[PDB]
Design a protein around this nucleic acid. Structure first.
Lengths: 81, 95, 107, 23, 74, 91, 91, 106, 83, 97
DNA sequence: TATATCTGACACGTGCCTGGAGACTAGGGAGTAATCCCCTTGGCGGTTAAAACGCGGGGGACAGCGCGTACGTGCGTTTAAGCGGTGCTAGAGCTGTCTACGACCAATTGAGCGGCCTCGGCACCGGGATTCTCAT
DNA sequence: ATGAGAATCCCGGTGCCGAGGCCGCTCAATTGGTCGTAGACAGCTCTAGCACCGCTTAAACGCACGTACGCGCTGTCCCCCGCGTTTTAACCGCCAAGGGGATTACTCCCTAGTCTCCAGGCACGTGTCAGATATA
């Protein structure tokens, strides 16, 4: 249903992410690169979350399912259960 | 006057490392999550806390990358980070 | 007459709840007697240290209510706790204020 | 208090301050 | 008598200073411990800032206070 | 249902008798407690499976704590672990 | 006592009916099988506890494969496993 | 008539041993019926693909005994077995021959 | 036992060059050797402090290959070919 | 005579040691390091010979991984010689620091 | 900013109800003692591969310098995010129920393990004809 | 540019000790019965997720411009590489010695299990006090 939607990740949002990262000056080719990084990362997490829900026989992806996917990939996330 | 280039960037680092809020807009992030998950299983539903968990996880991941990329760019005697530096950072990281 | 066993060990974590979660966690067939006592004391100690450091951080930032930024600042500022929780993301955590020294233009 | 002979805290004193530092 | 200051790196500095000293002298004291001269050392003590001709006796000095290097080379 | 929140709050009043925590901080501390619980229990389980025993005891948990916790956290955690076990066995 | 050496050798003679295997390579295949068995088992155990159940069925390991194997390995292994399960229940 | 479960399901891995290891391994209180069949089929499949690639490597060096050098080559020259065995070191396995292209003459 | 001193110098320069040239390293500066000593020291320290605690929980006086394999599996560095 | 260019022998040794699979550290001094370090935890410990060989097989694989990461971080910043900066940044990006 | 008037999240009362605590009981996990033999530790010497050590030199690290261009900064403008209602459901969650699937026990028997030959794939030697390097 | 020259790959003999193929044999998988509860399934409530519409405003975006900074070039010096000589200790092999790991048998006490009892934490109301606000 949905079109190019990674462009909602905007250039000043990536700039804020780098400014929190500690980056003083950013080249202009990074905005196409970090969109691919987000695409890889969120596909790898959402694939596991969807398989967790499909095993649990539900339709809603829940916060604990996201936590279990992220814990399976080594990123434990505190504060959602 | 007009600020010298770099000073505003240092002030932005001072701001966005003091703050804790979500640096990506929530509705386009939601639509991105829904269209990524569109491909695996059609017609899912999402708890809003699950979409917020994805929000914070992906932002913290990208902050980790930008700190490592900043290290790689300082290692290369530069100040601008580059896609070279990103690719090296995550290749050493194991990705 | 009642005499709760966590009070027998002189603790504040629930020894009965820890013993139950040991017995139904499929960790082993049997579960020893002093095992939930030892583990409840260890858990209580780790919470004690992180809450003490977060209380110091909240008092230093002049706020009497520990928010999760104070936990982030408590954890990431000492070696042992940052080595323990080194792969742990904290919701509304934020980052330590680090700036590399090269990006500080002189004169 | 009770939890002052039971923890680890010796050195150094740690600063936890954050200042919006304008001009 | 023993006063601390955070750096822009994030690092605290340990130093002992007589509590009636000036502010240029303690910029020299921190210049002894860091690699930063006081041409760019802008200090803040609880909102109101610091000027080198002033002394610690007028600026609320105690045991173990805090200073903060900030920014803004004009 | 069921949390550690009451117990965390008791330890909080015992350490800093003036402060409080918001509910997000309580949720993070609760997730913290659950995580270290399952880490230590998962290490003591496989210690018992290595040594061909079938009872997780205080010795098993002591060696699992000494593996997991780095630095002086192990040296303190072992200490009050044995303190609590002795105080429990006396009563 | 007890290896998978016999069974790995049977699979080897099925695949390459001429080649042999050294003992130092057979031990590596043995450690391989123990590693992936423990991974899939400890993963399906976590699935069974996340869904509040008590049995581990073939539905569990069908998803525990999908979390652990990457790419086409999962699509082939799920097919191979369900072919074996259907042949088992049919006969 | 014996008719073991592995022969009953058409496999070459011990379904009985997989069941015994699942029971005496504290993974759950109960073990279903099709679960050891599924594990045995999966394990037999993965060792079939690894021995396939190892046999190809050991033939391409003109040998018959597969050694951990061929095991290392067969695993590292395939992306899926890399990602499956990323944190794995193999004893007497060696390294892939890879020179970074900058260091070449001249 | 008797003295048992300074075996970190038993890791000679040409050995470190061999390990470097498996990694495809064409040129090597001089300060690397003391760094490689310092890194290998702390890596062996971590694996031995895990394996010795494994043995003392097993109530033994010898350190086994399976204890080493368990200590290495613990740190995300699983090793095959020793059981 | 005859003399080679300084680096041709280096490429020769790289091809050689990547073709070969033997251990590269001498066994008795490594085997003596292990007891140097193990004195600091419990004295009078004994070692199975396969345990010593496992420690060799592990630590050499770790150091091969280190030098192949520092080689990348030294090709980055456009050099050829590894410097200790490369080792520090490799262990820093890896999360070992 | 004094005085007064409104607010929300937390701190603090109530009941309840269910999981924790207590007593007893037995049976199997585990401690402990003997024993026995594999394996580790510590010698010894010969040899020789490998480490160590100069030594020259050349190639790469590094510092300096100049150029231009890609990026920071700032201002108008324009586009969605966000808030705030509204409602309308699809599913999440809980409850009874009954069944059929897994645990368990007893008896058996073929599979797989320890052990023992054996021969050939492979390591090695000894040439011996090819193929990258380097001053021409 | 290329012939000398060091790698260097390869062909064929030789021996060897490891991979593999039988043989008891024993013990774990199998078969075939109860039994009892886990969960499959129907059913019901109800809640939170999803579409929606409109107002506001702030954050994105587009553009112009002026640099700081990346990047290339140049020289220069120093330090690491290839190589020949000494020297050293690793390695191979052998040979005692004992010590601690593995096993087995015996006892015992410690934890699962069942039952009963009851109070501690869950849930949900209420105050209360730091925070915002209108006028003077």
């Amino acid at each position: 249903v949905l079109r190019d939607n990674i462009q909602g990740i905007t250039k000043p949002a990536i700039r804020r992410l780098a400014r929190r990262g500690g980056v003083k000056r950013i080249s202009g080719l990074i905005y196409e690169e970090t969109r691919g990084v987000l695409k890889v990362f969120l596909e790898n997490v959402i694939r596991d979350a969807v398989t967790y829900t499909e095993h649990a026989k539900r339709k809603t992806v829940t916060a604990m399912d996201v936590v279990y996917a992220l814990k399976r990939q080594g990123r434990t996330l505190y504060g959602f259960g | 006057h007009r600020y010298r280039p770099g000073t505003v960037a240092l002030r932005e680092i001072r701001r966005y490392q003091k703050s804790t809020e979500l640096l990506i807009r929530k509705l386009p992030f939601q639509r991105l999550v829904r269209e990524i998950a569109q491909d695996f299983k059609t017609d899912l539903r999402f708890q809003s806390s699950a979409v917020m968990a994805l929000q914070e996880a992906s932002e913290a991941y990208l902050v980790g990358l930008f700190e490592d990329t900043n290290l790689s760019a300082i290692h290369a005697k530069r100040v601008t980070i580059m896609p070279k530096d990103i690719q090296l950072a995550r290749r050493i990281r194991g990705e | 007459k009642a005499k709760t066993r966590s009070s027998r060990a002189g603790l504040q974590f629930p020894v009965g709840r820890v013993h139950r979660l040991l017995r139904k966690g499929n960790y082993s067939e049997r579960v020893g007697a002093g095992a939930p006592v030892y583990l409840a004391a260890v858990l209580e100690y780790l919470t004690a240290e992180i809450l003490e450091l977060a209380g110091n951080a909240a008092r230093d930032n002049k706020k009497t209510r520990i928010i999760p930024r104070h936990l982030q600042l408590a954890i990431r500022n000492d070696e042992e706790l940052n080595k323990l929780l080194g792969r742990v993301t904290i919701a509304q955590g934020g980052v330590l204020p680090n700036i590399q020294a090269v990006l500080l233009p002189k004169c | 208090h009770a939890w002052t002979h039971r923890l680890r805290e010796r050195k150094q004193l740690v600063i936890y301050e954050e200042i919006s530092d304008p001009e | 008598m023993q006063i601390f200051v955070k750096t822009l790196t994030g690092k605290t500095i340990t130093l002992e200073v007589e509590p009636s000293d000036t502010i240029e002298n303690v910029k020299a004291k921190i210049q002894d411990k860091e690699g930063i001269p006081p041409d760019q050392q802008r200090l803040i003590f609880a909102g109101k800032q610091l000027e080198d001709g002033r002394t610690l006796s007028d600026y609320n000095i105690q045991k173990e206070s805090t200073l903060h290097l900030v920014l803004r080379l004009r | 249902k069921e949390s550690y929140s009451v117990y965390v709050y008791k330890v909080l009043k015992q350490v800093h008798p003036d402060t409080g925590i918001s509910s997000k901080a309580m949720g993070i501390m609760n997730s913290f407690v659950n995580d270290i619980f399952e880490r230590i229990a998962g290490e003591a389980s496989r210690l018992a499976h290595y040594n061909k025993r079938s009872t997780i005891t205080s010795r098993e948990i002591q060696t699992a704590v000494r593996l997991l916790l780095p630095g002086e956290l192990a040296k303190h955690a072992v200490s009050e672990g044995t303190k609590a076990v002795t105080k429990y066995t006396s009563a």
